[PDB]
Amino acid sequence: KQVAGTMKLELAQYREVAAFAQFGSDLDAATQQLLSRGVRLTELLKQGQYSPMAIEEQVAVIYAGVRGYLDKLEPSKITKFENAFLSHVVSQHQALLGTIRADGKISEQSDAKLKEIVTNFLAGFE
Amino acid sequence: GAGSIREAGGAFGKREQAEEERYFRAQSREQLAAL
Amino acid sequence: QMSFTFASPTQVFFNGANVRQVDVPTLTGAFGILAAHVPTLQVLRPGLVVVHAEDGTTSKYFVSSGSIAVNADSSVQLLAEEAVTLDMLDLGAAKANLEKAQAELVGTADEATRAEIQIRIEANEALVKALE
Amino acid sequence: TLKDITRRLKSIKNIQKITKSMKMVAAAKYARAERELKPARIYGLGSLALYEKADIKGPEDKKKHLLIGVSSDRGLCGAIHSSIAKQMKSEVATLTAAGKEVMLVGIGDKIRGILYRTHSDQFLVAFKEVGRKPPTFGDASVIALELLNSGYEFDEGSIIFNKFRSVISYKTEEKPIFSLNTVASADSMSIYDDIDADVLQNYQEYNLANIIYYSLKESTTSEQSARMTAMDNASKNASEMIDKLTLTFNRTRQAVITKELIEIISGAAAL
Amino acid sequence: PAPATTFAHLDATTVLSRAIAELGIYPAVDPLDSTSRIMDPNIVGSEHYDVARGVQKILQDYKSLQDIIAILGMDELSEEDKLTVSRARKIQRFLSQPFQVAEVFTGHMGKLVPLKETIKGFQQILAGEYDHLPEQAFYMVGPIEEAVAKADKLAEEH
Amino acid sequence: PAPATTFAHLDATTVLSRAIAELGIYPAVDPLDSTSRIMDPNIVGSEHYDVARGVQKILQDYKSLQDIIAILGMDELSEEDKLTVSRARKIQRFLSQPFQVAEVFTGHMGKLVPLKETIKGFQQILAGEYDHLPEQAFYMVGPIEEAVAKADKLA
């Protein structure tokens, strides 16, 4: 709920300003930021077939997306970033995923831990 | 429903075809020179 | 009595202002311009332009080309194609590009394409003396 | 036909969306190109104060003549490229009638592609790439060179551009361009000191790049606003057409459903 | 009702469009409406699936750019957009193929292209390895080798 | 079904239109939909046939331009297209005519134009002999001389 409220608002604003695409090089920084966040988010919603993700993994990915930790990457690598980040979190941070799965909510502890993990992965990502 | 201006076939589709293919014919006869 | 007008193609420094003296680097040799100066019209060469406000306080811009035109009604219109204040130029590239210009002249012998070097030489020679 | 109306609705909706996006882009471009007109209107107009204080009138006896029409490459502006060409060919015949040989120059692909039909040999040189990027002094300086490295001994000249006044309206204007033999011979230039026929040549060659630069700034902040207005009108017209076609589409879909009902009912009641 | 009802009874539908045949492309297969049930990266491998999905994506973005080309003009488009439209037109032409049973209609030799030649040719056109060739060199050929050969012939003769 | 069936029984059809009647053009005869089996050079003459076919071609050209004119405005036309549009609008206005039976609800005298005046006026308009008169000068007149006189009177 927490993360998808923000995601829905961002995607709604991107759908409002998406007609001005192919003209983003001649618009102000507000419309350009909207377009960028929206493109990254739509790239975050793409999913393979017969690969359904758990709830904690979905919320981790959408957190890494909507917090602004993906505006630095150009869209053609968002899929690979999402896949590799998923692999890293599942193979390293089973404890945080377990706490989110059990609580169902994101504490401030878990918010700071997720910020830490996402920033360190961005540092270490290819 | 993108590409609808070309799917309709009115005045704005015929001129799309004309514009695009004249541009690309110019580019084609120019690229045949560089080869 | 003086109506100065100093303007780059993209920037305006003075406009109708009443300064008392300007010191421009005309091609036929520099001259200072106070009120009621004799009507003239010239074309600049690389060099400073000192503007003396009424308070006796100066202002020093480094024009690069253009045309000053003192008029019969004590109006001045100084138009520089590239007028950057001295706080934006560096001494190292001026002395370096001057060397790249001077060293490239001796390797050149055609009257036209060597004339473009001397103009680059004097433009950089006028730079080192303006900074320091 | 329902499929025809659906095709046309989709087409005109695409047109309306792209036209609105283009109007907002031209509004973003005009806001800038009008901020950079205030420092380029003090420069450019401060470059012609002499020819008005010295009151150079110009000689009407010389025959050779130059005529600069300033425009851009991109259309969708309205009467921008049409007002310039309207003024050029209006006075090309006016000077040709008096024996004054006129040779033209075209800044922008649009002003050339218009007059390339009628007056094509009366054409000294033409230029490109005017309009994509905001015009800079590097562009006005180049255009001035080939106006001198051309071997045309022009004895009088005028440059025609679209003077910008407001977002709603602009006017076409021509600024005179004097050569050396008229500014050196005018007996109102006898007061100007330290003047010889060389320091006037360097001053006439520079004041050719100014009046071209001042023209490229006025005719680009007057073209972006006109493109804004033209795209606004195009998007509005597309919107009213979409409204009418949606009314017709609803009528047609209701008629199709009723016709199918009547067919089924007549087939069922004939048993 | 008859086509819409028979769609569900098939595995690999191949829809033939009229707007594509009116472009001179043959067979008139519609790339953005044909469907197979074995177009699965675990059935045709990752390379074939990725090449097919890239072809379909670039053709859809071509369709989307055609509206801007309609109202604005081909001149103001970016070199990014111009290059993607060029690749899209070249992929369109390369999807066409001369048939051994259509000689009477075209006079051209019938070409049968193996699967790997197809995958490789479309991969190379997508990568840009032939952005210097005219789009008319990919029209009615076999693999990409015949495309560069036709390009050479057109370059010498013109 | 009723008009679509009655078309095949007529030697000459004069299809009226509401879209043309809204423009005040009366009679509202649709020029690009009315036909006749004696519209034949061997019957009416090569001059008459050529004038009729040229009028129809220019009206069809204007109709094809209508879309771009309506969306992208009048400016984006070439000057050849602008000339075609101007001549076509002049022809549209000239096809209008005041009827002698309408002397009670329009006020204007009813004009009866012989065939020679019709052919001559439309040939002249097609040739460009009146590209200086305004289009509202051809509206609701008889022969072409009356259009010229109305153009002079409005100025």
Curated annotation (Swiss-Prot), chain B:
It is found in: Mitochondrion. Residues 1-17 are annotated as: N-terminal inhibitory region. Exhibits variability in chain length, mitochondria have distinct pools of protein cleaved after the 24th, 25th, and 26th amino acid. The modification Phosphoserine is found at S4, S28. Endogenous F(1)F(o)-ATPase inhibitor limiting ATP depletion when the mitochondrial membrane potential falls below a threshold and the F(1)F(o)-ATP synthase starts hydrolyzing ATP to pump protons out of the mitochondrial matrix. Required to avoid the consumption of cellular ATP when the F(1)F(o)-ATP synthase enzyme acts as an ATP hydrolase. Indirectly acts as a regulator of heme synthesis in erythroid tissues: regulates heme synthesis by modulating the mitochondrial pH and redox potential, allowing FECH to efficiently catalyze the incorporation of iron into protoporphyrin IX to produce heme. Belongs to the ATPase inhibitor family. Homodimer; represents the active form and is present at a pH value below 6.5. Homotetramer; represents the inactive form and is present at a pH value above 7.0. This is ATPase inhibitor, mitochondrial. It comes from Homo sapiens.
Swiss-Prot record, chain C:
GO terms for biological process: aerobic respiration; mitochondrial proton-transporting ATP synthase complex assembly; proton motive force-driven ATP synthesis; proton motive force-driven mitochondrial ATP synthesis; response to copper ion. It comes from the Eukaryota. Keywords: Acetylation, ATP synthesis, CF(1), Disease variant, Hydrogen ion transport, Ion transport, Membrane, Mitochondrion, Mitochondrion inner membrane, Primary mitochondrial disease, Transit peptide, Transport. The modification N6-succinyllysine is found at K100, K129. One of its GO terms (cellular component) is mitochondrion. Subunit delta, of the mitochondrial membrane ATP synthase complex (F(1)F(0) ATP synthase or Complex V) that produces ATP from ADP in the presence of a proton gradient across the membrane which is generated by electron transport complexes of the respiratory chain. ATP synthase complex consist of a soluble F(1) head domain - the catalytic core - and a membrane F(1) domain - the membrane proton channel. These two domains are linked by a central stalk rotating inside the F(1) region and a stationary peripheral stalk. This is ATP synthase F(1) complex subunit delta, mitochondrial. It comes from Homo sapiens (Human). The chain holds residues 37 to 168 of 168 of the full protein.
Curated annotation (Swiss-Prot), chain D:
One of its GO terms (biological process) is oxidative phosphorylation. It is found in: Mitochondrion inner membrane. One of its GO terms (cellular component) is mitochondrion. Pfam families: ATP-synt (PF00231). GO terms for molecular function: proton-transporting ATP synthase activity, rotational mechanism; RNA binding. The keyword Ion transport applies. Keywords: Acetylation, ATP synthesis, CF(1), Hydrogen ion transport, Ion transport, Membrane, Mitochondrion, Mitochondrion inner membrane, Phosphoprotein, Transit peptide, Transport. The modification Phosphoserine is found at S120. It is a peripheral membrane protein. PROSITE patterns: ATPASE_GAMMA. The modification N6-succinyllysine is found at K23, K89, K128, K244. The keyword Nucleotidyltransferase does not apply. Isoform Heart is expressed specifically in the heart and skeletal muscle, which require rapid energy supply. Isoform Liver is expressed in the brain, liver and kidney. Isoform Heart and Isoform Liver are expressed in the skin, intestine, stomach and aorta. The modification N6-acetyllysine is found at K13, K29, K89, K128, K171. Belongs to the ATPase gamma chain family. Component of the ATP synthase complex composed at least of ATP5F1A/subunit alpha, ATP5F1B/subunit beta, ATP5MC1/subunit c (homooctomer), MT-ATP6/subunit a, MT-ATP8/subunit 8, ATP5ME/subunit e, ATP5MF/subunit f, ATP5MG/subunit g, ATP5MK/subunit k, ATP5MJ/subunit j, ATP5F1C/subunit gamma, ATP5F1D/subunit delta, ATP5F1E/subunit epsilon, ATP5PF/subunit F6, ATP5PB/subunit b, ATP5PD/subunit d, ATP5PO/subunit OSCP. This is ATP synthase F(1) complex subunit gamma, mitochondrial. The lineage of its organism: Eukaryota, Metazoa, Chordata, Craniata, Vertebrata. The gene is ATP5F1C.
Curated annotation (Swiss-Prot), chain F:
The modification N6-acetyllysine is found at K57, K111, K116, K153. It is found in: Mitochondrion inner membrane. The modification N6-succinyllysine is found at K153. The modification Phosphoserine is found at S46, S64. Homotrimer. Component of the ATP synthase complex composed at least of ATP5F1A/subunit alpha, ATP5F1B/subunit beta, ATP5MC1/subunit c (homooctomer), MT-ATP6/subunit a, MT-ATP8/subunit 8, ATP5ME/subunit e, ATP5MF/subunit f, ATP5MG/subunit g, ATP5MK/subunit k, ATP5MJ/subunit j, ATP5F1C/subunit gamma, ATP5F1D/subunit delta, ATP5F1E/subunit epsilon, ATP5PF/subunit F6, ATP5PB/subunit b, ATP5PD/subunit d, ATP5PO/subunit OSCP. It is linked to Hypermetabolism due to uncoupled mitochondrial oxidative phosphorylation 2: A disorder apparent in infancy and characterized by euthyroid hypermetabolism, failure to thrive despite excessive caloric intake, intermittent hyperthermia, and developmental delay. Belongs to the ATPase alpha/beta chains family. This is ATP synthase F(1) complex subunit beta, mitochondrial. It comes from Homo sapiens (Human).
